[PDB]
Design a protein around this ligand. Structure first.
Ligand code: CDL
Ligand code: CDL
Ligand code: PC1
Ligand code: PC1
Ligand code: PC1
Ligand code: PC1
Ligand code: PC1
Ligand code: PC1
Ligand code: PC1
Ligand code: LPP
Lengths: 120, 73, 118, 168, 300, 98, 125, 230, 78
């Protein structure tokens, strides 16, 4: 008599697809209709604490990323102090600063190489 | 021309499958209830935990973020 | 100023009694950075701070003046201990390093991994 | 071992309408745009279409369903983000599924569904491995659905209905 | 916290006896008594070794104070002991007995046979014994008497090899294990091997960090699996466990955090201990190939 | 709290589980089987052969009964069982923890 | 079953007999008892390894149990004194040995199991 | 059976609503920040510009299947199709296509291509080769029959996703029981053989090449019933 | 729900001796009045004896030796 597309039969099948046939009618359900409220709250709290810790590790300790994937492009970071001066003054000062930076790198390298005998 | 081929062996496999007993399926149906089981990615939701993480990282940036030294390598 | 990486700001060398007073762990006492370490420890004692603050502060906050000398000394100490300043040069250019041997002792045995054939 | 053997079916002359959505009752996505209710329902379904596309969840919002008893084939008009499409299904390949089964088929957490998506009346085509979802605000033809060819006494198969789709 | 070898030996025997009682808690069953007796026999062997080492120390130096022994052993390093037919180095023999007892109590390869059977104890007792209480006695001995082992040829050769072998063995057996308590026990064996290898590297700070991380997270994981077993009605095998995330929501997430920390995984508090161990690993060993391969396999 | 007076073991009824529920669950399990034709004909006094359970089908039904009832049944007991009455009696009187 | 396989110094042959059939001397059993006990043991082991196992496949479990059921029906039909029946018994005993798992799950409702005798019950005396 | 209503301080479904993220229940109400609510409320999305963008710039309805019967284009003017793979074929195609982008890209981008290759080699030999690659090599994308030749044309996915078709005589086809190959290739069937049918394996005796058919593949009744294949 | 009868005395089953306690097995049995047990449990009984156990152990550990060799070679050439 009944046919598919009948709402009552569809509801019956939806509720009975995964039923426990060995149980009495009205109590033949297998799913849990809820989750322990206090347990879930505490679990989510501790999970959030762990996630925050992992993220802080990722952020402040990128050593794993550096040694596993290499150094990625760094977002721009600079100061606009040089814009205060303009013209030949700016050009000469910029060239002097560039020369000083290169000389500083070389000075660091040579100092590291030379200072091997500082500690007697 | 009387040669066993795809159709013949498809029928053989269908017959083999039909020979199974539904008793085991009936007793085990409860195991695979969709209302009762999910996947680890679905259960472990990072939506709000990531929001708290962002709040904490923002607080760090605006409290101790100033006093850090760039390390280029 | 213009002092070597092992000397501190005051160019003062602490005696054994002073080291015992400002007791220094053997790990640091073994190295050459005791003179730069002691001022940093004294500054931390004068201005105690939490471990969270120590981790999250990249300039050591109040004790930055002494930490600069200590950090320079630590860099030089560790670099000379592991010979990294020569190993990195050989890694960067083995051929040129052999051409003008930075250290034949290390060059004669150095062999970069086949996987790292950049 | 179930094999997808095709029978090359064809439509008959006079179909019998079984499903007709009260919304989207007009013909054409242009008519849906010009109709107030159709436009808002389309916007609410936009996440449904997004789930169809990016989450690889095979599902279709079905409207204006007809039945051909001579060949026993259902003609479904489905609404997608682009327009109305016509599809044909064989009754032998159509089985009912629970709403939770429909949700759990996809491994991605689906967006919060709208309130007009009929959860009880969700069906599954095994040949296409696809889901059909109807609209709550709709009209069902009682005489059409009470056709002898649609009876469970003829379309029922325990192994197919209960054991064919095991999501786990 | 022992001030002299006599108090150390007293504490050694006391932990042995109390661990025996905890293992034999189910006194009505004689099956539990067999595991308890196995642990008791191994503990008595370790007591013999420790007692003999203490006797050698007392005969050499007329003192049992720990600080005095640590600050005096270097003077007597050059001495030898005339035994039955061989002239054994004094430091080598003393360190041999100490390392033997330490291996027995830390469940290294060969002497670990009792640890899997000690899981008969209730989960709290198992967690306490396997986290930082019973299985770290050898690590404590090595750390406390480090000046002795620094001048020990036997220690130099034996600590890294046995540590790495135990690490590999425990790691693989734990990976292939199917029972929760057995898995944790074999993981404990592997981490004790890693602790031995860290001490071999010789950075006491790294050893202490490894000990703390392992103890805390092993204990937490043990508690979580105990809740799981209690829910599952004392069935400790997860072949009968499935879909427990909803029935034990807190346990699932707590176990996730505790396990990611315990098993050294990237971007976790437990990655640095293994990183430092590999940083400190020495390369002058003759069996370095086997040592390094075993360490890598155990770590993975 | 237990009274200070001497109290003896109280064997209320030999059944440690509701025998009616045990019997109904066992009958449902039996009816689930393919060889079983008429669930109505099954009674506690009905023998396995007459209800239609073959000797080989019996072991399958008993394994699933063990799974359902959370107990293990020895081969000796399973072979001693002669009717659904005996089966349900043994299962109900069984202490699930032995 | 007493579940005392790993205790009382059983030899491998005795343990195999205990696993396949409830008895240590299967010769005392008759044909029906032998076949039924072996079928029960095979089904129990297949359920343990392919239902309550590591990433178990239920379709494979169904196919395997169906094949085993057909084979055991043929075995029961066969006469006791047949080399074919002997071959079937040897095949399934070998299967039991292959699936033998040290530290296999022992139900708490059986004697000699873990937690079997944790408590001493005081008598009315 | 539920007695929560008997107590005023007992938990409620309003208190359990927060579990809908981790628990699957049919929708009850729409929050203000749901995608559906946002789209239906904000008038920007109602603009014909956005509507036309949705209509055009996305997956088309033309490629959507419209029937349970499929008649793919004939490979040869006289051939007729029998079997065709729908989803696993596309998945294998897209996987093997990675060799045309990841591999040259890896060579031109990675600092240590030799390190990448040394890592990939053992990865391929364990858990990848048997997992996907051998199954794809033996996978049958499509099968047609040429009656004049009395042959079967089989389409296969090659390296970098290239598709190639080969002919095999119907007289050289045999059925290989899964029992004869399970022990030989346990690992292959253990980790990679799930997609294809285990009990419907065929092989060409002359060339010793196997044919794997997808479980979720479409077969033609007429093609199966053609006298050449019966 | 059901009112269970008091815990069964059957939970501890009295053990009745049916075999002579040989003096050659003195202290080789963990004597008990309910569940007597052998002093040593052999779970890996599929191995007939220790010698076959050694053979199986070495044959299977060959795989781990190969794994160690491959890992060391990879680290050695890199
Ligand atoms: C002028 C206006 C300009 C507007 C610009 C808008 C730009 C939007 C850019 C979007 C970019 C993509 C985002 C993707 C998110 C999802 C990713 C994902 O799940 O993939 C993994 C997915 C698997 O993950 P899954 O869990 O299974 O996915 C399930 C669902 O995704 C279901 O996922 P779920 O729900 O489980 O979680 C997903 C979640 C992921 O979200 C996160 O993880 C982010 C967490 C927050 C980070 C906040 C950082 C900044 C703030 C830091 C803290 C500041 C503190 C300030 C001080 C506070 C003091 C108290 O998605 C979001 O990001 C949501 C947006 C964040 C909203 C809340 C932000 C905070 C607001 C302020 C606080 C108040 C909060 C509410 C109240 C709380 C209680 C009081 O893998 C895939 O397969 C991906 C396939 C591709 C899917 C694509 C679907 C979207 C397609 C969009 C196409 C483009 C449309 C363009 C329209 C243009 C119209 C004009
Ligand atoms: C200064 C130079 C000094 C050089 C010194 C060289 C010293 C060489 C010593 C060789 C000692 C051989 C001892 C053989 C004992 C046999 C015992 C017996 O009869 O057992 C029966 C028993 C079978 O009876 P069953 O009843 O069927 O067993 C039941 C099982 O359940 C059944 O188990 P199942 O079927 O489930 O699986 C078992 C599976 C187990 O899986 C495997 O066996 C595969 C993995 C094997 C790994 C072997 C070790 C890898 C290398 C480690 C080296 C460490 C030391 C050096 C470190 C240097 C570091 C710088 O094995 C197989 O079935 C495959 C059979 C083929 C295995 C490979 C045989 C290789 C023989 C040697 C060939 C050498 C050719 C040299 C050509 C030179 C040309 C210039 O045997 C087995 O089960 C297989 C045992 C296989 C042992 C292989 C040992 C090979 C050692 C090679 C060392 C090469 C060193 C080179 C140094 C070069 C320096 C420059
Ligand atoms: C004295 C100084 C005290 C400093 C305290 C520093 C705290 C550092 C915390 C670090 C992270 C560790 C988290 C541990 C667990 C707690 C978090 C948690 O459980 O998250 C999961 C929870 C929920 O996880 P969920 O995803 O399972 O929950 C979903 C269900 N609902 C929607 C109901 C939440 O996360 C959140 O609720 C997100 C919170 C985001 C906002 C964070 C800031 C809140 C600020 C409140 C005070 C505002 C005062 C304003 C005063 C105005 C005066 C005019
Ligand atoms: C019962 C409740 C009790 C109270 C609860 C208290 C909660 C926990 C509070 C923790 C406060 C400290 C947070 C430190 C964050 C990490 C800092 C860091 O990366 O160190 C860099 C510092 C800065 O060092 P540096 O820059 O001077 O030099 C480092 C040297 N080299 C470069 C060679 C490495 O580095 C270290 O000292 C080493 C740290 C190694 C460990 C990294 C762990 C990362 C994960 C952090 C988890 C934090 C807890 C969880 C989230 C809490 C959110 C509130
Ligand atoms: C009913 C009462 C129940 C008991 C309540 C007890 C509450 C305890 C709350 C804190 C516990 C967890 C502390 C964080 C984890 C340890 C952190 C650590 O390692 O130390 C780092 C830090 C050490 O300091 P630091 O790390 O910030 O660095 C110090 C900096 N220098 C070195 C320069 C000085 O310690 C702590 O933060 C822990 C708290 C301080 C110690 C408090 C001890 C006294 C407690 C007084 C209360 C007594 C209550 C008695 C109740 C009796 C009931 C019967
Ligand atoms: C010691 C010796 C060591 C040797 C190590 C060797 C390492 C290098 C190996 C080289 C592999 C070369 C692969 C060739 C791939 C094509 C093969 C083929 O015929 O396939 C045709 C296939 C199939 O052709 P078809 O004819 O079947 O169909 C055409 C395409 N479809 C299917 C879509 C219709 O076509 C392609 O895949 C075309 C790929 C074109 C793009 C190829 C390069 C992509 C990567 C560019 C560089 C990296 C990104 C840079 C981004 C920069 C941004 C600013
Ligand atoms: C030269 C001959 C041809 C070589 C072809 C390349 C190898 C085979 C194809 C590999 C495709 C996968 C590339 C993933 C790139 C991920 C980002 C990265 O680290 O790239 C730079 C790095 C290398 O760039 P690099 O050399 O500049 O990095 C610096 C060097 N290290 C990292 C060692 C410090 O990529 C790799 O390390 C790839 C190693 C080979 C992987 C082989 C396959 C196993 C992985 C399966 C695929 C999925 C992996 C997902 C990984 C996700 C993140 C953990
Ligand atoms: C050859 C190159 C040099 C390196 C030499 C070593 C080669 C790699 C050796 C890897 C051995 C790993 C053994 C893991 C055993 C896990 C057992 C377990 O728990 O059960 C199975 C568990 C699954 O447990 P389960 O419970 O989910 O299901 C079990 C199902 N049954 C029982 C049916 C099997 O995990 C696995 O299955 C994964 C292990 C198998 C796949 C191994 C892939 C190895 C890839 C190697 C990549 C090498 C990269 C290059 C660099 C390497 C050197 C630096
Ligand atoms: C040339 C070859 C020489 C070989 C010499 C080998 C000597 C040592 C042999 C081992 C046993 C020694 C006697 C102690 C027996 C203890 C039995 C016991 O407690 O049973 C519990 C257990 C039995 O329990 P079980 O493990 O079978 O089961 C219990 C666990 N459950 C409950 C899970 C089942 O005994 C054993 O397993 C063996 C214990 C071995 C460790 C013994 C430690 C003491 C070692 C003393 C060495 C003395 C050397 C003297 C000089 C020799 C000169 C050759
Ligand atoms: C030193 C080599 C370093 C690695 C080089 C990688 C090259 C990749 C491009 C290969 C192109 C040709 C493929 C030929 C296919 C074929 O028909 O291959 C057929 C061959 C020959 O047949 P048989 O060996 O089965 O008899 O099969 C092989 O197994 C040998 C070739 C193996 C090629 C494997 C390519 C995939 C590598 C995957 C790496 C791990 C995963 C990486 C992330 C996705």
């Amino acid at each position: 008599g009944t046919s598919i597309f009948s709402r009552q039969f569809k509801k019956a099948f939806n509720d009975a697809k995964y039923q426990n046939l060995t149980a009495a009618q009205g109590e033949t359900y297998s799913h849990l209709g809820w989750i322990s409220n206090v347990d879930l709250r505490l679990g989510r709290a501790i999970f959030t604490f762990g996630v925050v810790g992992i993220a802080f590790c990722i952020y402040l300790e990128p050593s794993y990323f550096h040694e596993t994937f290499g150094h990625m492009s760094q977002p721009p970071k600079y100061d606009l102090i040089d814009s205060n001066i303009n013209g030949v003054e700016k050009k000469l000062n910029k060239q002097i600063l560039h020369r000083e930076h290169n000389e500083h790198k070389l000075d660091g390298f040579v100092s590291m190489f030379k200072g091997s005998d500082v500690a007697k | 021309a009387g040669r066993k081929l795809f159709k013949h062996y498809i029928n053989e496999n269908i017959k083999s499958n039909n020979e199974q007993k539904l008793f085991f399926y009936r007793v085990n149906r409860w195991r695979w209830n969709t209302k009762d089981n999910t996947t680890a990615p679905k259960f472990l939701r990072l939506k709000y935990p990531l929001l708290v993480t962002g709040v904490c990282l923002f607080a760090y940036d605006w409290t101790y973020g100033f006093t850090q030294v760039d390390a280029h390598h | 100023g213009h002092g070597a990486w092992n000397e501190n700001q005051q160019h003062y060398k602490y005696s054994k009694e002073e080291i015992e007073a400002y007791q220094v762990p053997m790990r640091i006492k073994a190295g050459p950075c005791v003179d730069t370490y002691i001022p940093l420890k004294k500054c931390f004692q004068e201005n105690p701070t939490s471990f969270a603050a120590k981790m999250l502060d990249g300039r050591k906050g109040k004790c930055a003046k002494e930490f600069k000398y200590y950090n320079t000394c630590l860099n030089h100490w560790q670099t000379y201990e592991n010979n990294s300043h020569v190993t990195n040069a050989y890694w960067a250019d083995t051929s040129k390093a052999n051409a003008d041997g930075i250290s034949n002792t290390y060059g004669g045995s150095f062999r970069k991994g086949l996987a790292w054939l950049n | 071992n179930y094999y997808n053997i095709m029978r090359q079916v064809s439509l008959d002359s006079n179909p019998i309408v079984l499903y007709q959505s009260s919304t989207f009752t007009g013909n054409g996505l242009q008519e849906f745009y010009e109709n107030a209710d159709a436009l808002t329902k389309y916007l609410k379904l936009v996440p449904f279409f997004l789930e169809k596309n990016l989450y690889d969840h095979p599902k279709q919002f079905v409207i204006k369903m007809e039945f051909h008893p001579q060949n026993k084939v259902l003609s479904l008009d489905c609404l997608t983000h682009q327009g109305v499409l016509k599809k044909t299904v064989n009754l032998e390949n159509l089985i009912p599924v629970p709403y939770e089964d429909y949700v759990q088929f996809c491994r991605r957490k689906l967006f919060n569904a709208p309130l007009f998506l009929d959860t009880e009346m969700i069906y599954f085509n095994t040949f296409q491995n696809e889901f059909y979802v109807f609209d709550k605000n709709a009209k069902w033809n009682e005489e059409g659905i009470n056709h002898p060819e649609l009876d469970i006494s003829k379309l029922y198969n325990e192994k197919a209905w209960f054991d064919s789709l095991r999501i786990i | 916290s022992s001030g002299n070898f006599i108090v150390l030996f007293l504490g050694w025997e006391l932990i042995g006896l109390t661990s025996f009682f905890l293992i034999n808690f189910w006194s009505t069953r004689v099956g539990t008594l067999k595991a308890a007796f196995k642990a008791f026999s191994f503990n008595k062997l370790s007591d013999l070794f420790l007692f003999f080492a203490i006797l050698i120390i007392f005969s050499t130096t007329y003192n049992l104070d720990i600080l005095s022994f640590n600050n005096q052993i270097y003077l007597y390093e050059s001495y030898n002991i005339d035994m039955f037919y061989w002239s054994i180095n004094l430091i080598e023999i003393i360190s041999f007995f100490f390392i033997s007892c330490a291996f027995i109590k830390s469940a290294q390869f060969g002497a670990h046979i009792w640890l899997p059977d000690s899981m008969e104890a209730p989960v709290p007792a198992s967690a306490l014994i396997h986290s930082a209480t019973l299985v770290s006695a050898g690590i404590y001995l090595l750390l406390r008497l480090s000046p002795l082992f620094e001048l020990s040829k036997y220690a130099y050769f034996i600590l890294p090899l046995i540590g790495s072998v135990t690490a590999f063995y425990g790691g693989l057996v734990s990976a292939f294990q199917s029972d929760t308590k057995k898995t944790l026990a074999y993981s404990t064996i592997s981490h004790c091997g890693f602790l031995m290898v860290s001490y071999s590297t010789g950075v006491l700070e790294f050893v202490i960090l490894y000990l703390y991380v392992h103890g805390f997270f092993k204990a937490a994981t043990f508690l979580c699996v105990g809740n799981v077993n209690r829910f599952n009605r004392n069935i400790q095998d997860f072949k009968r466990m499935g879909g427990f995330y909803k029935y034990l929501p807190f346990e699932c997430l707590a176990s996730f955090v505790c396990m990611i920390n315990l098993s050294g995984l990237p971007l976790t508090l437990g990655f640095y201990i293994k990183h430092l161990l590999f940083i400190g690993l020495v390369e002058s060993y003759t069996l370095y190939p086997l040592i390094f391969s075993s360490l890598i396999l155990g770590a993975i | 709290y237990a009274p200070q007076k001497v109290v003896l073991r109280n064997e209320k009824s030999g059944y440690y589980a509701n025998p009616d529920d045990v019997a109904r669950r066992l009958i449902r399990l039996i009816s689930l089987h393919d060889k079983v034709q008429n669930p109505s004909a099954i009674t506690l006094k009905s023998t396995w052969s007459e209800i239609g359970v073959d000797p080989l089908s019996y072991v399958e039904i008993m394994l699933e009964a063990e799974n359902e009832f959370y107990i293990e049944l020895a081969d000796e007991d399973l072979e001693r069982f002669r009717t659904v009455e005996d089966a349900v009696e043994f299962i109900a009187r069984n202490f699930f923890t032995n | 079953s007493k579940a005392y396989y790993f205790v009382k110094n059983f030899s491998w042959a005795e343990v195999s007999n205990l696993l396949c059939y409830g008895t240590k001397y299967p010769t005392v059993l008759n044909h029906q008892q032998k076949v039924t006990r072996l079928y029960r043991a095979t089904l129990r082991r297949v359920y343990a390894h392919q239902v309550e196992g590591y990433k178990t496949d239920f379709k494979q479990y169904n196919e395997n149990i169906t094949d085993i059921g057909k084979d055991f029906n043929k075995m029961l039909a066969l006469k006791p004194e047949s080399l074919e029946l002997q071959a079937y018994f040897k095949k399934y005993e070998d299967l039991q040995e292959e699936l033998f798992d040290p530290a296999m799950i022992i139900d708490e409702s059986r004697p000699y199991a873990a937690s079997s005798g944790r408590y001493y019950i005081f008598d009315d005396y | 059976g539920d007695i929560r209503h008997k107590f005023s301080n007992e938990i409620t479904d309003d208190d359990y609503d927060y579990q809908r993220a981790m628990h699957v229940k049919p929708p009850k109400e729409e929050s203000l920040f749901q995608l559906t609510n946002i789209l239906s409320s904000v008038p920007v999305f109602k603009t014909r510009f956005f509507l036309d963008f949705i209509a055009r710039n996305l997956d088309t309805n033309s490629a959507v299947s419209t029937s349970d019967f499929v008649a793919p284009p004939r490979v040869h003017e006289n051939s007729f199709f029998v079997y065709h793979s729908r989803e696993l074929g596309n998945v294998i195609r897209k996987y093997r296509s990675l060799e045309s982008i990841v591999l040259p890209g890896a060579l031109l981008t990675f600092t240590y291509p030799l390190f990448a290759a040394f890592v990939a080699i053992p990865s391929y030999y364990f858990m990848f080769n048997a997992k996907i690659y051998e199954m794809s090599r033996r996978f049958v994308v499509r099968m047609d029959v040429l009656p004049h030749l009395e042959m079967i044309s089989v389409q296969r996915i090659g390296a970098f996703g290239i598709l190639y078709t080969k002919l095999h005589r119907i007289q050289d086809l045999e059925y290989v029981p899964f029992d004869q190959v399970k022990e030989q290739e346990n690992y292959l069937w253990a980790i990679g053989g799930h997609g294809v049918d285990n009990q419907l394996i065929f092989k060409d005796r002359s060339t010793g090449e196997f044919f794997y058919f997808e479980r979720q593949g479409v077969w033609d009744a007429k093609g199966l019933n053609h006298p050449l294949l019966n | 729900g059901w009112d269970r009868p008091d815990v069964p005395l059957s939970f501890n089953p009295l053990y009745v001796h049916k075999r002579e306690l040989s003096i050659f097995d003195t202290n080789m049995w963990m004597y008990d009045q309910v569940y007597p047990e052998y002093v040593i449990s052999y779970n890996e009984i599929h191995l007939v004896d220790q010698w076959k156990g050694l053979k199986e152990s070495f044959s299977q550990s060959a795989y781990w030796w190969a794994m160690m060799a491959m890992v060391f070679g990879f680290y050695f050439i890199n």
